Structure formats: C-alpha cells, structure tokens
Design a protein around this nucleic acid. Structure first.
Lengths: 378, 100, 133, 63
RNA sequence: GAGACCACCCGGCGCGGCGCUCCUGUACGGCGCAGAGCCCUGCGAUCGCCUGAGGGACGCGCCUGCAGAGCGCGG
RNA sequence: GACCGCAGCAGGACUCCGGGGUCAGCAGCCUCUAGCGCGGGAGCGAACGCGGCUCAGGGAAGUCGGCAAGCCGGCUCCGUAACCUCGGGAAAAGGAGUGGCUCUGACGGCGCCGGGUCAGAACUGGAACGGACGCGGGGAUCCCGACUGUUUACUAGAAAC
C-alpha cells in the first residue's frame, strides 16, 4: 500500500558506503582545471587543523541586511608549515586516462620524507633512494629525465612533503602530497617552474590569497559503531516499543525479499573522507609576526596563539591559513586545501576588525596574558 | 637500589567504574612499579593497601608516595613497595637512591 | 512584513500560549499556527520573533476578540536567539501583538520591551513600542 | 574594540561572548557567563559573591 | 586525532613534576577593637582580615627525576 | 542456609526473643552485638538492551487513551465551596512559615529538684532550612454499583458475586 504521508528519505546515498576511510590522509583527487595561459600557479597545500577563533568583520554585501554592518563569524585556523618540493611528476592524457610518464625525484631527499618510506626508521634498513642519489648528484639524471616529461607529459604535478618538526604534532614522518602546477603557457614552462622550486620550501602565502575560496578535504571525526538514529537521522520510535525505540522498524517489504542498500542500518559513523567546499580565506599570516592577529581596533600585540594555547593542538608556530566557518576533521588532522572548483560568485569581501585571542580552554575573559596580569594585579 | 615515586591514583581509577576503584588502584600501582623497577614481581606491603583503601572503594586518595626497594636479585628480583607518608606532594619527583 | 528575515531560533511551537502586549483587551493568545510554514512530517509548526502567528484569544480575553482565529506577531521570546552580530538575546516572557492581515495593530499601545526583528518587520510595531531591544 | 560589562559580575565581556537579557522593566542586562546569568536569576546578591567587582569594591580591594 | 575484537594513524613511549591557563569561589589556621546575648570569666552561630585565596585539572609550553628503540618472532 | 518444588531452584514454608541514632513510628536511612562476603574471574568502556540521571524553548501539539514519567507530599498557623442520607464533603480549594546559634517564658517539680515539650524573642546565612529520607497533584462532571467485603491459583478484581 501507499506510504500514506510524504517524507524524504533520511540521508544521502551518494556518501555510501559509510565505511572508515582507507586512504592514509584526505587525498585531493580532482585538481582545479588548468585554464592554460593563466599566471603559473600551484593548486593545493597540506595543513593541520589548529582550532577555531570567531572574528568580527565589516560586511559589504549590497542589498543585504548585513550591508555596512559588523558580523561576528566563526573562523578555522589551519596550521600550514612550509612544504618542501621533493619530486616532479608528469602525466600524459592517454585513452585509458591520465597515465604517469615518470617521477623525477630530487637529488637529495630530506629525512622527514624519508621516514615516511619505512615503518620504524630507527630499526629500518635505510636502503631507500640509495642508488638514486649516486645516479643523480650531477644534475644530468634530473635534467635528462625532466626533458622526457616535457615531451610526453600533459599534466605536471610536484610532490611535496610537510615539515612535521615545525608543527606541534607527534608525526615525525612527513606526508607526501602531489600539487598540480597549473596555468602555464606551456608544459615546458610548467617543468621549468617546477624545477625552480625543487628542494626548496613553498609557503601557504604563495599558493593562496585572502578572499579566495578553497575547499578543505579531510577525514571526519570518528564516532565508532553507531545506530540508525545517530548514523542516519531516523526518528526514534515510541517509548512503548519492546526491544528498544532506537531502531528502523521496517527494513523492507516482503518483496524485494533481500534487504536493500537504501534502508538505514547500524555501523561506523565517522572517519569518512569528505570534501567541504567554497570557504573564504580570511587571513594567511605567520605566527612569527607578533601583530598578525591585531587590527586597528585591537591596539594590543595579540598573535594567533590563544591565551592558554590551542586546546587539543599546540603552538601554531610559523605560517597558518585562517578560513571562514568550519573544515572536516578533528584538531591535528591533516587537511588538504585546494583552489575552489566552483567558488560562490557573490561572496562579501573580507575586512577583519577583531580576532579573538581569548582562552579556548574554559571561558577566557582576557585577549592577552599581560591583560590577565593587570586584572588579577598581585 | 631504592626508588621513591608518586603515583596519581585519581588518574589510574579514571575511565573505570567507581565501585571498582580501590582494587583497580592496587593493580595500577603494581603495574607502575614494574615499569619503575623494570621487574616482573611486585609485592605491596599491607601499609600501601591500608592507604589506598583508607577512603573506601569509590574514592581513592589523589596521590600515593611509595618506596620501592628492589629487595631480591640473583634471578628473582622482587620489588617491595611501602607507603611513605608526605605532608604534601609539592615538588616531589622520582628519586632513585643507592645501588645494589 | 518588510524585507528579508534572517533565521533565528524559533522558540514558540504550536500550542504555545503567549501573553498579549497590546491593550486590545486580550490577556493570553493561544498559537493555532504559523503564517508561511511548509513543514515536514511530524514537525510542529514553530515561530520566532517577527513571525505572524494565527492565534485565538483565551477565555480571560474580552468576548468580541474571542472565538475568532486572528493574526498576531511574536514580539518577545524566552528562547535565546543569535543575531548575526553575535549578540545572543533573550526576553523575560514570550509575547505577541494582535495585527490585521495588512499590518495595522488592533491595540493602540504595545506594553514592555519589543524585539528589533519584530520592529523591523512591522513599521507600526516600531513606532508603537517604547523600547526596541 | 567595543566591550561590555557582566551586569552582575562587573567583569568585561569581549565581543561575541556572553548573552543579553531584556527585562520587563525595559533594562537590558548583559551577562558574561551562564554563571553571571544563574547567580542573577537565583537572586544571589552581587555583594556576598567575592569574585564580583561589586563585593571587591565594597571591600575596597578594587577601588 | 582511531577502536566491539580487529583494523587504522602514529612511535625511544610513558610516568610525575614545574610553569602557563582554566574551573570553583576566598582554604585550614591565626588574629580581632565584630557578634545577639548569657552567666561566668568564659561561651557563642556567624563576621572581618590574611585570601580572585586554597583546592583541582584530561588543555598548553617545559624537564630540574626516573625512564624510554628486543639477543622476541617471522623473513 | 540440610524441608518441598527433577537441583546446593530470585519460588514457597509455623513460631519465639528483639539494642542505638534520626524520627510520630517496629517506616525509610545509617549503626552496636551477632553473622558474613552467593553457578567464577580479568580486561574494555562500541552499537543496542535493561536499571537509572539530567535536559534549552514550548508544554499533550504525542497517543486508542496523559500509558509512562513528572508535579504534589512532613509539621505548624490561617483559611475552605456547591452539595449532603446533616454523620460528611475536607487534607476541599487556596495561602504563610520551617535551619543554626544566643536567649526568654510556661508546666509539675521545694530539703527545691526533675522534666522535654509548647510558645515568644533577637542575631545570623550565595534569597537557606520536611536541605538525605520518608511523604495526597488538584478541580468540574457524566455512567454504573450504595457501602466494607468476595471472585475466575496460571490472560478478565469488574458495572459481576
């Protein structure tokens, strides 16, 4: 018989299978389109979520209630320590699909990247790249192989590794990420640009700008095995139900005899790889500048680090990217940030006027530690 | 080799049922002493068990100062742990004193 | 109502009896429904400050108003709501002012403080209210 | 930038934090915490509560 | 940061200190020219001062202490 | 603690004697004496279930139906309606107080000695006080059966008997 009343299905079936993510970290997958002839640019970066702040901005959306008004809005600070280029990878467009021509690795590979190649570095063989270093180190191997990429490669990407020592993380090994060189006048120009950054650090400030929209790709917080009400948003049944109210009562009709994928069922509720999209970059600054989080209204030094530090993170030393709203993942989780594939055309320009530096640990009524000393006197 | 060490019982009964707190504290003290003495056998003086059980099964004292004496060696190496009362656990930290 | 509203936490569901700010001679208005509410299955219609609600005057109210579904506007709500300026605001009591379908108020005066969201939506509420908070 | 004061607490409220209550006596009372808020709504005296700037001003500690 | 068990992501862990910060609301004790009174030369709930004190921390930085990487098993 | 239920079975099974505190109490909650740690233990802290706890704003819109939960409650002093078989209703309904200290009267007791209740008073205290515990939610009707009783052990406690 008919369902008798109209309600939407609970949940997106696109996000199925709702399984723990099997990729090591969030992976960029599609990179923004080339648009050949654009200013030559890098398309992505890896950062670690540091925390959230809340900013007061002046809004200039025209024909809005908030036009010419001040708005307190949430911000997410992603720590983005400089990544170092370690390889140049070129992919031909083949009738099978993008096919990698070759990866020409750097003459010298840093210890952080090298520790990724082994499960336990101290007890490891240390045999990786041993012959490669000898074959290179004249520059002939790197340049002859690089030429092959210019002739066959249609897409050029660069491998880069994060510096985990510049982060408060316990990783030690460095995440390797492919970032696509984009908007070159020609692939040879992409390879020449790519060789210029080889063995050299790249900064978040170079890759992105303020007011640009980026999409953050990361693995979500895990909630473990979870039932239908939390995992799929089904209505809890009436209290009188025997065997519990937290359940999907009917898993299907007599026919189809088998249970269907569409019906909600209990299982893992977190650690899913998700891309969030179109988030504006509010600020891209380094913590080494003491007034990075100080505006004209602040009139106090205030740096990015909150009083009491970042809860469930660290000292956010060095470069960081502040973005509007939220990003997938818990604090300390690697987040790959990419130039937006489809940015929101009508977005207000960013004009931050105050950034909270108050304690996120507990409730903080002091934006600086020096102000706490003055309030509490002796 | 005698070790004087503090163990925070409140942190070691965390995550466990409050009724099972004083026996869970005894098991924790035994394991902690194994990772201090680097031994496998830990004996606890009844003075340690009187201190841990002083405030009942649900509430364990927040901290215990313990004297581990590595009495026994030559393929036995037991650890004898005694409670050492202290007015406050202020700048108190592990103090390994003496040698076999 | 004038302009585009901004979503604010909707404190009053259907069945919410709210005190009457206007002197029209109603004391407590019973919320039958919310104007402009396409709702999902099982969801009680809910309304916030600045939302027009079909109400029925209670037994305490003057007989002429009583027994007719009448329009009103929520002017105050106990539920805390966040303004887009980060001000979380709440009121001592939930209240409503009885208004014709056009915008005019049945009562000459509005008693007590009135929320900005109602004041912006209804020009007559803004002029009548002594305090807009 | 602009800052307010806990009406009960008398401790400054940085922007974006705290709640504002408007009374039937037409006075907005800005409260820094849910503590400031519940102390007031239980009729607890500001003086009698030592952390409030009012009890410290009476003890002269603040003034 | 991940979990029913596993798996995952990481690895000279961890422990317990010290700072920072936050929570709670001014510690025990001492003193008093506070205290309604009482009857005897003391009692007395409270109160004030020391004392935004004391206590606590699962958050952040640090190490002034013990420590911490199998001669395990596979290959 | 050995009886009877296939059993060393949350089931039944007749008595006797019965301390302390708080309390009106042999109630509830703690305790002396006396007894004594039950077909086992470790981890872990998922879903879900069982036994609980709290919940912003609304306040039965939920449902066959307020089912379940919650409100209420001790004591003192006010105050209390229709109706009525004048006995009731009635704890109707509805208010107010309650702690601790320091006292002050009463009352028998005189060789003044022995009571622990009833009043009244100051001073107190994050705006607390039956602080746990124990412990009616109330009202307006309508239908039956006057009532207290009895009933289908093991699905009907009823308006049935």
């Amino acid at each position: 018989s008919h369902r008798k009343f109209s309600c939407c299905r609970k949940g997106n079936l696109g996000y199925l299978p709702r399984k723990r993510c099997t990729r090591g970290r969030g992976r960029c997958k599609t990179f923004p389109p080339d648009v050949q002839g654009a200013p030559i640019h890098l398309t992505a970066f890896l950062g670690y979520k540091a925390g959230c702040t809340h900013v007061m901005r002046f809004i200039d959306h025209r024909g809005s209630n908030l036009h010419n008004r001040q708005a307190i809005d949430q911000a997410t600070i992603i720590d983005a320590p400089p990544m170092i280029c370690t390889a140049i990878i070129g992919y031909a467009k083949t009738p099978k699909g993008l096919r990698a021509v070759t990866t020409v690795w750097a003459a010298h590979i840093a210890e952080p990247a090298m520790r990724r190649f082994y499960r336990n570095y101290f007890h490891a063989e240390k045999t990786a790249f041993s012959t490669y270093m000898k074959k290179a180190a004249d520059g002939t191997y790197i340049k002859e192989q690089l030429g092959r990429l210019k002739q066959h490669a249609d897409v050029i990407r660069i491998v880069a590794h994060t510096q985990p020592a510049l982060t408060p993380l316990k990783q030690k090994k460095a995440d390797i990420m492919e970032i696509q060189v984009n908007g070159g006048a020609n692939v040879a120009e992409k390879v020449d640009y790519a060789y210029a950054l080889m063995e050299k650090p790249i900064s978040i400030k170079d890759v992105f700008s303020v007011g640009a929209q980026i999409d953050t790709i990361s693995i979500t917080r895990g909630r473990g095995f979870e039932g239908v009400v939390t995992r799929w948003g089904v209505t809890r049944l009436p209290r009188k139900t025997r065997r519990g109210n937290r359940k999907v009562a009917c898993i299907g009709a007599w026919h189809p005899a088998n249970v269907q994928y569409t019906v909600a069922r209990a299982g893992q509720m977190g650690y899913f790889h998700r891309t969030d999209t179109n988030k504006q970059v509010f600020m891209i600054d380094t913590a080494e500048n003491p007034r990075c989080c100080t505006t004209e209204f602040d009139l106090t030094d205030k740096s990015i680090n909150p009083v009491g530090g970042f809860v469930n993170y660290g000292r956010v030393q060095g470069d960081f990217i502040m973005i509007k709203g939220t990003c997938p993942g818990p604090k300390r989780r690697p987040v790959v940030m990419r130039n937006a594939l489809l940015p929101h055309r009508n977005c207000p320009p960013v004009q931050l006027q105050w950034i909270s530096t108050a304690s996120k640990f507990g409730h903080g009524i002091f934006e600086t530690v020096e102000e706490r000393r003055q309030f509490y006197a002796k | 080799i005698v070790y004087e060490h503090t163990i925070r019982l409140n942190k070691a009964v965390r995550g466990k049922p409050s009724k099972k707190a004083a026996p869970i504290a005894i098991r924790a003290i035994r394991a902690q002493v194994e990772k201090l003495a680097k031994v496998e056998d830990v004996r606890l003086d009844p003075s340690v068990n009187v201190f841990v059980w002083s405030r009942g099964i649900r509430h364990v004292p927040r901290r215990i100062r313990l004297e581990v004496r590595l009495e026994g060696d030559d393929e036995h190496k037991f650890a004898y742990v005694i409670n050492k009362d202290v007015e406050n656990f202020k700048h108190l930290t592990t103090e390994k004193k003496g040698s076999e | 109502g004038i302009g585009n509203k901004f979503r604010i936490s909707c404190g009053l569901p259907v069945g919410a009896v709210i005190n009457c700010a206007d002197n029209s001679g109603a004391k407590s208005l019973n919320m039958i429904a919310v104007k402009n509410w396409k709702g999902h299955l099982n969801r009680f219609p809910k309304a916030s400050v600045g939302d027009m609600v079909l109400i029925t005057v209670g037994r305490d109210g003057k007989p002429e108003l009583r027994r007719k579904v009448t329009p009103a506007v929520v002017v105050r709500q106990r539920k805390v709501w966040r303004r887009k300026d980060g001000v979380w605001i709440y009121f001592q009591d939930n209240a409503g002012v009885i208004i014709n379908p056009k915008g005019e108020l049945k009562g000459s005066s509005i008693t007590g403080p009135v929320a900005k969201e109602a004041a912006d939506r209804w020009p007559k509420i803004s002029t009548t209210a002594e305090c807009v908070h | 930038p602009r800052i307010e004061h806990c009406s009960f607490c008398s401790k400054p409220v940085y922007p974006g934090k705290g709640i504002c209550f408007v009374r039937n006596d037409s006075r907005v009372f800005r409260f820094c915490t849910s503590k400031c808020h519940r102390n007031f709504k239980m009729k607890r005296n500001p003086r009698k509560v030592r952390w409030t700037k009012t009890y410290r001003l009476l003890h002269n500690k603040d003034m």
